[PDB]
Amino acid sequence: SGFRKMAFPSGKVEGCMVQVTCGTTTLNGLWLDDVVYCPRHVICTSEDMLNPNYEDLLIRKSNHNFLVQAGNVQLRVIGHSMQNCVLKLKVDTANPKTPKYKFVRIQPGQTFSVLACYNGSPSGVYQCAMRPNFTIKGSFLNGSCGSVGFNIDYDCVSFCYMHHMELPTGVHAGTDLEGNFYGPFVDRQTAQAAGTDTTITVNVLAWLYAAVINGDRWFLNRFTTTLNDFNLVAMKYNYEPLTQDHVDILGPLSAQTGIAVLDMCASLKELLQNGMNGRTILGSALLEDEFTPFDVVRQCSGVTF
Amino acid sequence: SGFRKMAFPSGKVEGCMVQVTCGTTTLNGLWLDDVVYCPRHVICTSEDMLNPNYEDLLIRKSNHNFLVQAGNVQLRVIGHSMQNCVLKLKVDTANPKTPKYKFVRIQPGQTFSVLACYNGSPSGVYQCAMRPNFTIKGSFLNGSCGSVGFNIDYDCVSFCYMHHMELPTGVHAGTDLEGNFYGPFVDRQTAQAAGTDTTITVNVLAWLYAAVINGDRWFLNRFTTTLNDFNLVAMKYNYEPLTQDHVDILGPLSAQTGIAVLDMCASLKELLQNGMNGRTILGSALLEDEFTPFDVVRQCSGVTF
Ligand SMILES: *[C@@H](CC(=O)OCC)[C@H](C[C@@H]1CCNC1=O)NC(=O)[C@H](Cc1ccc(F)cc1)NC(=O)[C@H](N)Cc1ccccc1
Ligand SMILES: *[C@@H](CC(=O)OCC)[C@H](C[C@@H]1CCNC1=O)NC(=O)[C@H](Cc1ccc(F)cc1)NC(=O)[C@H](N)Cc1ccccc1
């Protein structure tokens, strides 16, 4: 019993982290097979991040300008190339610890674990969600760029995120492992703002289920609602609209608890308008929205890797 | 910027997890050098759990009765001993992945990372606190006994917890790696309940410093109180008393922010009597008490391992 914010075991990803230095700029890299991935802004000069032409910066740089370190072991660079906003450094040694992996682009509302790293070494691991405005609410300091986000399916590590920057709001932005930024953000020192961040409704509902599975039931009422009468209340409170795909994806949880999605939706509508009245759910005084239905099923069924 | 519930990287511990089977019962064990540690109720079914005489069941068992599996490979048990509630199986092969480690007994209020495992394979990692009533608020299903909690102090893995039981209230209980239970609990199916749980005052203050470090400053007032004055209110809300040792432990966070501990205490006093004004602090609507002062420093200074 119980329910916690649970990250994936970080071991398989620890073995791919390395340190990447270009000039005086050091950050983290991801070493898979004979390729080291990292943010292209590592090649930037100090006065190059204002108006950077990375294509042209890469021509000026030799393979010898890139120092990669796996532990205290130097990996010789024998090639450098740029896919979108990620630098790809070809090295002469294949990572013996390369896991079965895939590069995936995640959607808003989907969660993942982040291995925060500095100078190629891990600091900690936590669970994040891709917000509906394509930012993440992480914990990153200077030197954290190149840290990756990931999920694990049995033995396959699906890398979904690489950390690039911090917006003035304290939120975080980055790319997939193919260099495409999530959201409208770019790696130029320009005024860029995230749209209104909305609450991931399907996750709050998955979370309420998890609450039900664990014995928290004070919020369950006997009223019901329709998908449109709930969404009318939802959009007033900056909640994402609920669709039939969301009702279906919660099927498993509805089928383990016997509670109809729309029944839980009525309980949720009551909590939005009236609050919690100094009560808590799963130890929280807020409606948590960084648990997907799969995360709930995973943590209430014992899925191992 | 940012503040998340961050666990230690779990790689070093993943490489010590194995599966231990005795009869029909399987659970997780910890394989360090040539010894596997695991809960001693592995030698029990659901018949002797009334008044289990682990002394007889141990002698009545043979080395061949214990099946130990490290992934695919099978480890041959060549001896067995008991140290309180932990079983020690000597095997004929030493773990090549054994980290520098120590067995430590943690104090109430201290945190650690839990690597939840099932059938010797990790499922997830999350951060827990030893509650003042010597329970933890974990996430554990059937098959999870033997999962361990730990801290990483430099290059040394400090194992502090092995999971044994869930109490009917839904909280969890276990031992250090020497087999001594935290709290007045015993590894047998007899009536057991934890004392009343209090809030870890020193951890709440550390967390408020974390909020200040990350720009959350709305709850700061200009006031200052006395240690005795603060404790008078602390007791009214079921908060641990604040000792001078706690005050000193917060020294580093007071030094970084310029806010005296007794000034922070006055701000916490006002939050307790008047509530959080419908506002959040570091993404939470409750006062969080599972971050130690050290947890705050390492996440806000990027300590690596
Ligand atoms: C990682 C940089 C790194 O590790 O390599 C040098 C040590 C940085 C992580 C930031 C630091 C603090 N918390 C974080 O999440 N990333 C940056 O520092 C980023 C680098 C950058 C500068 C200019 C660009 F055009 C692209 C990338 N700088 C920032 O995030 C600053 N907040 C400035 C900023 C840049 C883009 C949009 C808004 C603000
Ligand atoms: C770990 C058991 C295991 O892995 O072995 C499988 C063969 C269990 C973890 C629990 C399961 C559900 N959620 C959890 O966190 N531990 C137990 O099941 C525990 C084991 C035990 C059985 C018989 C004994 F004599 C000692 C220990 N049993 C329980 O937790 C039950 N809640 C019963 C109970 C025991 C002590 C105090 C209160 C209730």
XYZ file of C-alpha atoms and ligand atoms in Angstrom:
688
model
C 0.000 0.000 0.000
C 0.934 3.683 -0.181
C 1.643 6.011 -3.081
C 4.768 8.056 -3.760
C 6.332 10.039 -6.575
C 8.430 7.185 -7.918
C 11.263 7.551 -10.406
C 12.653 4.744 -12.530
C 15.887 3.108 -11.327
C 18.635 5.268 -12.776
C 21.394 2.662 -13.120
C 21.137 1.988 -16.850
C 21.286 5.733 -17.502
C 24.103 6.426 -15.028
C 26.363 4.249 -17.188
C 25.852 6.511 -20.221
C 26.546 9.886 -18.585
C 29.848 11.562 -19.465
C 31.428 15.010 -19.212
C 31.869 17.170 -22.319
C 34.167 20.210 -22.441
C 34.582 22.694 -25.302
C 36.811 25.608 -24.332
C 35.778 26.650 -20.829
C 32.204 25.338 -21.172
C 31.635 21.981 -19.469
C 28.342 20.096 -19.377
C 26.919 16.574 -19.493
C 26.724 14.169 -22.402
C 24.874 10.944 -23.194
C 27.155 8.161 -24.457
C 25.293 5.515 -26.477
C 27.247 3.152 -28.757
C 29.991 5.368 -30.280
C 28.013 8.652 -30.187
C 27.949 11.306 -27.441
C 24.871 13.553 -27.445
C 24.786 16.952 -25.735
C 23.360 20.462 -26.242
C 24.945 22.298 -29.138
C 25.293 25.397 -26.983
C 28.429 23.791 -25.500
C 30.341 24.998 -28.582
C 29.259 28.599 -28.034
C 31.775 31.236 -27.032
C 30.987 33.468 -24.060
C 29.792 36.241 -26.398
C 28.261 33.773 -28.853
C 24.953 32.926 -27.128
C 23.372 36.238 -28.128
C 23.316 35.651 -31.905
C 24.759 32.158 -32.428
C 25.231 30.577 -35.856
C 25.930 27.037 -34.671
C 26.491 25.762 -38.221
C 29.383 28.189 -38.531
C 30.695 27.640 -35.007
C 30.998 23.917 -35.763
C 33.149 24.541 -38.849
C 35.573 26.571 -36.726
C 35.835 23.771 -34.148
C 38.150 20.791 -34.513
C 37.489 17.355 -33.083
C 40.360 18.241 -30.724
C 38.323 21.138 -29.312
C 35.921 18.597 -27.751
C 37.144 16.813 -24.606
C 34.902 13.929 -23.498
C 35.490 12.118 -20.196
C 33.858 8.857 -19.061
C 34.922 8.629 -15.436
C 38.496 9.880 -15.679
C 38.922 8.121 -19.051
C 39.222 10.292 -22.158
C 37.117 9.335 -25.185
C 38.802 10.511 -28.381
C 36.492 12.510 -30.671
C 36.744 11.482 -34.330
C 33.714 13.379 -35.620
C 31.309 16.199 -34.754
C 27.918 16.989 -36.259
C 24.697 18.769 -35.380
C 21.136 17.447 -35.536
C 18.790 20.353 -34.734
C 19.789 21.717 -31.279
C 21.807 18.660 -30.178
C 25.493 18.126 -30.867
C 26.491 14.579 -31.835
C 30.141 13.733 -31.136
C 31.514 10.576 -32.747
C 33.990 8.866 -30.413
C 36.467 6.055 -31.035
C 35.106 3.798 -28.266
C 31.654 2.229 -28.063
C 30.040 2.439 -24.626
C 30.173 -1.094 -23.158
C 27.224 -0.143 -20.926
C 24.940 1.005 -23.754
C 21.434 -0.244 -22.873
C 18.702 -1.228 -25.252
C 17.333 2.235 -25.995
C 14.993 4.294 -28.157
C 14.541 8.035 -28.675
C 10.904 9.040 -28.131
C 9.045 12.350 -28.278
C 6.633 12.589 -25.362
C 3.336 14.429 -25.191
C 2.083 16.985 -22.674
C 0.785 15.197 -19.605
C 3.263 12.326 -19.930
C 5.765 11.812 -17.114
C 9.401 10.729 -17.044
C 12.375 10.474 -14.701
C 15.283 12.923 -14.791
C 18.828 12.021 -13.772
C 20.254 15.368 -12.685
C 23.985 15.410 -13.432
C 26.908 17.805 -13.038
C 30.323 17.357 -14.681
C 29.194 13.969 -15.961
C 28.316 12.652 -12.477
C 24.816 12.000 -11.093
C 23.391 14.119 -8.300
C 19.875 12.692 -7.990
C 16.808 11.343 -9.757
C 13.256 12.678 -9.688
C 9.994 12.331 -11.597
C 8.741 15.137 -13.861
C 5.839 15.760 -16.229
C 5.776 17.547 -19.584
C 3.414 20.421 -18.824
C 0.650 21.329 -21.300
C 2.707 24.435 -22.177
C 5.717 22.225 -23.053
C 7.798 23.231 -20.027
C 8.934 21.019 -17.148
C 9.125 21.890 -13.440
C 12.537 20.440 -12.634
C 15.487 21.012 -10.297
C 18.444 22.215 -12.377
C 21.476 24.349 -11.534
C 24.296 25.731 -13.656
C 26.110 22.722 -15.086
C 22.940 20.604 -15.379
C 22.582 20.896 -19.163
C 22.895 17.554 -20.909
C 20.989 15.819 -18.126
C 18.370 13.595 -19.718
C 14.831 12.474 -18.982
C 13.706 8.922 -19.632
C 11.253 6.070 -19.111
C 12.047 2.338 -18.905
C 9.983 -0.434 -20.538
C 11.352 -3.734 -19.192
C 14.918 -3.477 -20.524
C 14.505 -0.610 -23.026
C 15.389 2.927 -21.926
C 13.305 5.432 -23.900
C 15.133 8.767 -23.741
C 12.654 11.632 -24.145
C 14.308 14.828 -22.893
C 17.640 16.648 -22.696
C 17.880 19.777 -20.555
C 18.810 23.077 -22.207
C 17.661 26.148 -20.278
C 15.661 27.810 -17.501
C 12.996 30.391 -18.269
C 12.703 33.500 -16.067
C 9.637 31.939 -14.430
C 11.754 29.187 -12.866
C 10.447 26.578 -15.324
C 12.614 24.465 -17.598
C 12.801 23.759 -21.303
C 14.671 21.312 -23.472
C 14.619 19.010 -26.472
C 14.112 15.402 -27.435
C 17.222 13.401 -28.297
C 16.788 14.439 -31.951
C 17.359 18.087 -31.016
C 13.784 19.325 -31.471
C 12.702 21.574 -28.621
C 9.478 20.857 -26.805
C 7.189 23.832 -27.263
C 7.915 27.105 -29.045
C 11.263 27.610 -27.307
C 14.637 28.121 -28.990
C 18.278 28.132 -27.885
C 18.856 31.836 -28.520
C 19.106 34.428 -25.743
C 15.736 35.951 -26.611
C 12.564 36.867 -24.737
C 10.566 33.622 -24.759
C 7.537 32.964 -22.564
C 5.387 29.912 -21.939
C 1.653 30.078 -22.452
C -0.755 29.547 -19.584
C 0.079 26.286 -17.824
C -3.074 24.193 -17.423
C -3.760 21.245 -15.126
C -3.571 17.747 -16.642
C -7.122 16.575 -15.943
C -6.618 12.927 -16.900
C -3.754 12.728 -14.381
C -5.754 14.230 -11.525
C -8.363 11.551 -12.234
C -5.750 8.793 -12.330
C -4.457 10.258 -9.058
C -7.919 10.171 -7.471
C -8.236 6.518 -8.504
C -4.880 5.762 -6.855
C -6.324 7.518 -3.822
C -9.335 5.189 -3.964
C -7.136 2.103 -4.332
C -5.272 3.196 -1.185
C -8.365 3.790 0.963
C -8.806 7.560 0.621
C -12.525 7.858 -0.135
C -13.817 11.008 1.585
C -14.174 12.799 -1.767
C -16.420 10.224 -3.474
C -20.014 11.440 -3.894
C -23.147 9.873 -5.369
C -23.696 12.553 -8.022
C -22.718 12.080 -11.659
C -22.060 14.340 -14.629
C -21.708 14.366 -18.397
C -18.435 14.839 -20.244
C -19.617 18.266 -21.432
C -20.991 19.532 -18.108
C -17.682 18.632 -16.475
C -15.584 20.235 -19.218
C -17.668 23.404 -18.908
C -16.549 23.612 -15.282
C -13.059 22.401 -16.203
C -12.158 25.164 -18.657
C -13.150 27.870 -16.171
C -10.343 26.641 -13.884
C -7.529 26.255 -16.444
C -8.037 22.490 -16.587
C -7.307 20.632 -19.808
C -10.460 19.362 -21.549
C -11.353 15.720 -20.985
C -11.876 13.596 -24.104
C -13.091 10.067 -24.781
C -9.497 8.866 -25.166
C -8.949 10.027 -21.583
C -12.078 8.219 -20.381
C -10.846 5.078 -22.144
C -7.254 5.240 -20.881
C -8.648 5.367 -17.345
C -10.623 2.209 -18.163
C -8.148 -0.122 -16.463
C -8.282 1.930 -13.273
C -12.068 2.164 -13.517
C -12.170 -1.613 -14.048
C -9.995 -2.319 -10.998
C -12.040 0.000 -8.761
C -15.459 -0.541 -10.336
C -15.911 3.253 -10.401
C -17.142 4.803 -13.638
C -14.933 7.573 -15.020
C -17.872 9.984 -15.172
C -18.649 9.187 -11.531
C -15.144 10.257 -10.524
C -15.480 13.317 -12.764
C -18.363 14.502 -10.580
C -16.231 14.153 -7.459
C -13.514 16.164 -9.196
C -15.915 18.923 -10.248
C -16.928 19.314 -6.596
C -13.292 19.663 -5.525
C -12.584 22.378 -8.102
C -15.458 24.653 -7.098
C -15.329 24.179 -3.314
C -11.755 23.150 -2.504
C -10.851 20.470 0.024
C -11.970 22.167 3.277
C -8.689 21.611 5.081
C -8.653 17.929 4.124
C -5.991 16.054 2.164
C -5.776 13.280 -0.430
C -2.807 10.895 -0.427
C -1.064 13.336 1.889
C -1.566 16.308 -0.442
C -3.693 19.431 -0.041
C -3.671 19.965 -3.826
C -4.976 18.065 -6.830
C -1.830 16.343 -8.103
C -1.562 16.073 -11.887
C 1.923 14.595 -12.459
C 0.764 10.957 -12.231
C -0.387 9.307 -15.443
C -2.868 6.407 -15.424
C 0.050 4.115 -16.304
C 2.129 5.456 -13.397
C -0.760 4.633 -11.060
C -1.190 1.123 -12.467
C 2.580 0.671 -12.378
C 2.845 1.615 -8.696
C -0.295 -0.309 -7.678
C 0.760 -3.506 -9.514
C 4.531 -3.839 -8.964
C 5.879 -3.440 -12.498
C 9.595 -4.263 -12.390
C 12.422 -3.618 -14.822
C 16.228 26.677 -9.685
C 13.516 24.251 -8.673
C 12.988 21.852 -5.805
C 11.783 18.264 -6.159
C 11.721 15.207 -3.942
C 15.044 13.912 -5.240
C 16.364 10.423 -4.555
C 19.947 9.250 -4.764
C 21.006 7.596 -8.033
C 20.191 3.922 -7.540
C 22.771 2.267 -9.811
C 25.185 1.110 -7.115
C 22.338 -0.588 -5.230
C 20.633 -2.110 -8.289
C 23.746 -4.234 -8.797
C 23.373 -5.829 -5.354
C 19.705 -6.838 -5.613
C 19.017 -10.568 -5.903
C 16.089 -12.938 -5.435
C 15.938 -15.288 -2.436
C 13.512 -18.215 -2.388
C 12.850 -20.629 0.467
C 10.002 -23.064 -0.093
C 7.020 -21.226 -1.573
C 8.109 -17.761 -0.379
C 10.292 -15.460 -2.488
C 11.621 -12.009 -1.624
C 14.553 -9.673 -2.272
C 18.019 -9.860 -0.786
C 21.064 -7.623 -0.732
C 24.248 -9.225 -2.090
C 27.418 -7.578 -0.761
C 30.704 -9.425 -1.363
C 29.989 -13.110 -0.523
C 26.923 -12.599 1.711
C 23.228 -12.157 0.906
C 21.132 -10.298 3.493
C 17.359 -10.646 3.568
C 14.438 -10.674 6.015
C 14.373 -13.774 8.172
C 10.635 -14.378 7.659
C 11.671 -15.951 4.345
C 11.931 -19.177 6.378
C 8.298 -18.734 7.484
C 5.109 -19.498 5.563
C 1.768 -18.312 6.983
C 1.455 -21.040 9.637
C 4.134 -20.329 12.254
C 3.708 -16.552 11.844
C 1.608 -16.652 15.060
C 4.517 -17.259 17.464
C 7.374 -17.811 14.974
C 10.357 -19.482 16.633
C 12.925 -18.391 14.063
C 15.583 -20.215 16.104
C 14.237 -23.675 15.241
C 13.230 -22.901 11.653
C 16.776 -21.680 10.984
C 18.467 -24.840 12.266
C 15.799 -27.012 10.631
C 16.672 -25.378 7.288
C 19.609 -26.441 5.123
C 21.788 -24.528 2.680
C 20.039 -26.317 -0.193
C 16.626 -24.988 0.872
C 17.727 -21.435 -0.030
C 17.537 -20.600 -3.743
C 19.421 -17.383 -4.533
C 19.198 -15.884 -8.013
C 21.211 -12.899 -9.255
C 19.371 -12.148 -12.480
C 19.862 -15.364 -14.449
C 22.818 -16.835 -12.562
C 22.118 -18.976 -9.502
C 24.214 -18.383 -6.378
C 25.125 -21.437 -4.318
C 24.463 -20.967 -0.602
C 27.344 -22.439 1.414
C 26.256 -21.263 4.862
C 23.513 -19.508 6.773
C 23.312 -17.500 9.997
C 20.836 -15.182 11.703
C 21.525 -11.711 13.076
C 18.259 -10.626 14.746
C 15.584 -10.223 12.027
C 17.986 -10.451 9.042
C 19.092 -13.700 7.415
C 22.715 -13.935 6.265
C 23.364 -16.430 3.460
C 27.030 -16.985 2.658
C 27.414 -17.750 -1.052
C 30.360 -19.174 -2.969
C 30.763 -16.090 -5.202
C 31.373 -12.480 -4.183
C 29.469 -9.718 -5.946
C 31.853 -7.949 -8.363
C 29.574 -4.887 -8.236
C 29.779 -4.490 -4.450
C 30.150 -0.767 -3.650
C 32.030 0.780 -0.805
C 29.282 0.614 1.803
C 28.456 0.815 5.489
C 25.537 -0.264 7.670
C 24.141 2.725 9.585
C 21.188 3.166 11.943
C 19.443 6.424 11.154
C 17.666 8.732 13.574
C 14.003 9.781 13.367
C 13.621 12.733 11.029
C 16.452 11.615 8.741
C 15.663 10.741 5.130
C 16.812 8.047 2.735
C 16.144 6.707 -0.745
C 14.170 3.474 -1.151
C 14.780 1.156 -4.120
C 11.558 -0.841 -4.328
C 12.158 -4.308 -5.789
C 10.081 -7.362 -6.684
C 11.625 -10.781 -7.377
C 15.100 -9.300 -7.120
C 14.461 -6.658 -9.778
C 14.029 -2.923 -9.090
C 10.711 -1.212 -9.774
C 11.350 2.388 -8.729
C 13.176 4.692 -6.353
C 11.693 7.279 -4.005
C 12.675 9.332 -0.968
C 11.368 8.524 2.527
C 11.785 9.881 6.050
C 12.063 7.913 9.298
C 8.961 9.285 11.012
C 9.254 10.304 14.682
C 7.135 7.201 15.486
C 9.711 4.976 13.686
C 7.523 4.161 10.682
C 7.955 5.287 7.092
C 5.304 6.389 4.608
C 6.433 4.164 1.765
C 5.022 2.480 -1.323
C 5.275 -1.301 -1.000
C 3.312 -4.229 -2.441
C 3.394 -7.958 -1.785
C 6.838 -9.216 -2.782
C 8.707 -6.064 -1.749
C 10.328 -7.249 1.500
C 14.083 -7.099 1.238
C 13.940 -3.766 -0.583
C 16.482 -1.475 1.044
C 16.827 2.197 1.844
C 20.132 4.001 1.671
C 22.051 7.246 1.486
C 25.165 7.953 -0.574
C 27.848 9.689 1.508
C 30.560 10.503 -1.058
C 31.492 7.146 -2.622
C 30.106 5.092 0.284
C 26.590 3.657 0.136
C 25.109 3.844 3.650
C 22.419 1.155 3.911
C 19.967 2.102 6.668
C 16.692 0.222 6.077
C 15.392 -3.176 4.973
C 11.655 -3.536 4.462
C 9.660 -6.048 6.513
C 6.022 -5.135 7.097
C 3.009 -2.931 6.516
C 0.900 -1.939 9.493
C -2.918 -1.995 9.193
C -2.881 1.825 9.233
C -0.985 1.684 5.925
C 2.471 2.749 7.113
C 5.592 0.595 6.821
C 8.131 -0.862 9.219
C 11.509 -2.509 8.863
C 15.003 -2.956 10.232
C 18.511 -1.666 9.864
C 20.848 -4.063 8.069
C 21.886 -5.520 11.446
C 18.319 -6.802 11.799
C 17.214 -4.435 14.564
C 13.748 -3.024 13.983
C 13.181 0.700 13.937
C 10.526 1.337 16.570
C 8.840 -1.073 18.981
C 7.931 -3.517 16.212
C 8.636 -7.215 15.712
C 8.621 -9.428 12.618
C 5.554 -11.403 13.594
C 1.812 -11.221 12.979
C 0.779 -9.871 16.378
C -1.112 -6.682 17.181
C 1.163 -3.696 16.580
C 0.510 0.026 16.193
C 2.770 3.045 15.954
C 2.702 5.874 18.441
C 1.253 9.215 17.423
C 3.258 10.793 14.629
C 4.556 14.352 14.931
C 5.782 16.787 12.278
C 9.557 17.067 11.885
C 10.026 20.728 12.780
C 13.651 20.963 11.713
C 12.780 19.571 8.272
C 9.944 22.057 7.777
C 12.333 24.943 8.470
C 14.912 23.535 6.053
C 12.173 23.336 3.418
C 11.202 26.957 4.071
C 14.850 27.894 3.498
C 14.723 25.929 0.238
C 11.716 28.037 -0.743
C 13.623 31.252 0.001
C 16.661 30.040 -1.954
C 14.334 29.450 -4.920
C 12.663 32.877 -4.732
C 9.496 31.909 -2.802
C 9.503 34.679 -0.182
C 5.860 35.655 0.407
C 5.662 33.927 3.791
C 8.597 35.853 5.284
C 7.687 38.319 8.025
C 9.857 40.904 9.752
C 9.381 39.247 13.136
C 11.622 37.173 15.391
C 10.733 34.977 18.346
C 12.350 32.948 21.110
C 13.158 29.251 21.088
C 10.821 28.727 24.058
C 8.124 30.940 22.524
C 8.303 29.013 19.251
C 8.131 25.634 20.993
C 5.016 26.699 22.920
C 3.210 27.102 19.593
C 5.013 24.112 18.069
C 3.517 21.750 20.646
C 0.013 23.102 20.002
C 0.210 21.828 16.404
C 1.933 18.493 17.126
C 5.393 19.647 16.019
C 8.564 18.143 17.453
C 10.263 20.599 19.834
C 13.176 22.504 18.298
C 16.507 21.862 20.030
C 19.672 23.935 19.902
C 21.228 21.100 17.894
C 18.524 21.536 15.253
C 19.205 25.286 15.262
C 22.885 24.591 14.614
C 22.096 22.055 11.883
C 20.201 24.809 10.052
C 23.212 27.139 10.304
C 24.330 26.609 6.708
C 20.903 27.517 5.318
C 20.681 30.582 7.554
C 24.154 31.600 6.353
C 23.245 31.299 2.667
C 19.997 33.276 2.991
C 20.884 35.785 5.708
C 17.733 34.800 7.638
C 18.340 33.848 11.260
C 16.814 30.547 12.350
C 14.687 32.280 14.990
C 13.473 34.702 12.316
C 12.430 31.754 10.133
C 10.732 30.292 13.213
C 8.598 33.424 13.534
C 7.539 33.007 9.919
C 6.676 29.348 10.535
C 4.775 30.366 13.672
C 2.584 32.664 11.575
C 1.974 29.969 8.948
C 0.824 27.520 11.632
C -1.619 29.879 13.358
C -3.085 31.482 10.205
C -2.543 28.929 7.439
C -0.935 29.211 4.035
C -3.370 31.802 2.609
C -4.524 29.423 -0.124
C -1.019 29.751 -1.572
C 1.585 27.135 -2.452
C 5.200 26.883 -1.294
C 7.495 24.999 -3.694
C 4.490 23.427 -5.368
C 2.911 22.262 -2.087
C -0.172 23.475 -0.205
C 0.974 21.767 3.034
C 4.116 22.340 5.079
C 6.514 19.600 3.968
C 8.647 17.833 6.568
C 10.555 15.131 4.623
C 13.500 17.302 3.516
C 16.452 17.448 5.909
C 18.751 20.496 5.996
C 21.336 18.361 4.171
C 18.800 17.330 1.517
C 18.271 21.046 0.854
C 21.975 21.890 0.622
C 22.798 19.059 -1.767
C 19.899 19.789 -4.120
C 20.515 23.557 -4.105
C 24.321 23.206 -4.483
C 24.345 20.302 -6.951
C 26.331 17.786 -4.912
C 27.239 14.793 -7.080
C 28.274 11.203 -6.430
C 22.954 24.508 -18.334
C 24.266 25.070 -18.887
C 25.453 24.137 -18.638
O 25.332 23.188 -17.939
O 26.685 24.401 -19.252
C 27.455 25.408 -18.653
C 27.769 25.040 -17.205
C 22.074 25.642 -17.802
C 20.944 25.173 -16.892
C 20.245 26.415 -16.279
C 21.241 27.003 -15.288
C 20.514 27.327 -14.143
N 19.246 26.396 -14.124
C 19.080 25.873 -15.397
O 18.214 25.132 -15.732
N 21.485 26.321 -18.949
C 21.732 27.725 -19.153
O 22.430 28.332 -18.402
C 21.149 28.466 -20.359
C 22.238 28.350 -21.404
C 21.810 29.070 -22.665
C 22.224 30.524 -22.866
C 21.791 31.258 -24.124
C 20.956 30.519 -25.175
F 20.603 31.163 -26.319
C 20.565 29.061 -24.982
C 20.985 28.331 -23.714
N 20.915 29.805 -19.898
C 19.680 30.094 -19.190
O 18.884 29.231 -19.013
C 19.422 31.504 -18.664
N 18.207 31.494 -17.862
C 19.315 32.517 -19.793
C 18.131 32.219 -20.702
C 18.372 31.539 -22.045
C 17.193 31.243 -22.970
C 15.778 31.634 -22.551
C 15.538 32.318 -21.207
C 16.717 32.615 -20.283
C 6.725 -8.415 2.304
C 6.511 -9.975 2.190
C 7.342 -10.645 1.082
O 7.909 -10.052 0.237
O 7.432 -12.030 1.045
C 6.643 -12.587 0.040
C 6.845 -14.093 0.062
C 5.385 -7.760 2.751
C 5.200 -6.257 2.457
C 3.761 -5.836 2.616
C 2.829 -6.545 1.669
C 1.768 -5.691 1.354
N 2.387 -4.275 1.438
C 3.542 -4.354 2.168
O 4.202 -3.441 2.399
N 5.345 -7.982 4.170
C 4.294 -8.734 4.779
O 3.416 -9.205 4.160
C 4.345 -8.972 6.262
C 5.258 -10.173 6.237
C 5.234 -11.009 7.479
C 4.328 -12.221 7.507
C 4.302 -13.093 8.734
C 5.192 -12.755 9.918
F 5.181 -13.545 11.018
C 6.102 -11.540 9.868
C 6.131 -10.654 8.644
N 2.977 -9.178 6.668
C 2.129 -8.025 6.833
O 2.556 -6.960 6.654
C 0.666 -8.111 7.208
N 0.201 -6.741 7.158
C 0.434 -8.759 8.571
C 1.011 -7.951 9.721
C 2.343 -8.360 10.336
C 2.898 -7.556 11.501
C 2.126 -6.357 12.043
C 0.809 -5.952 11.427
C 0.241 -6.757 10.271
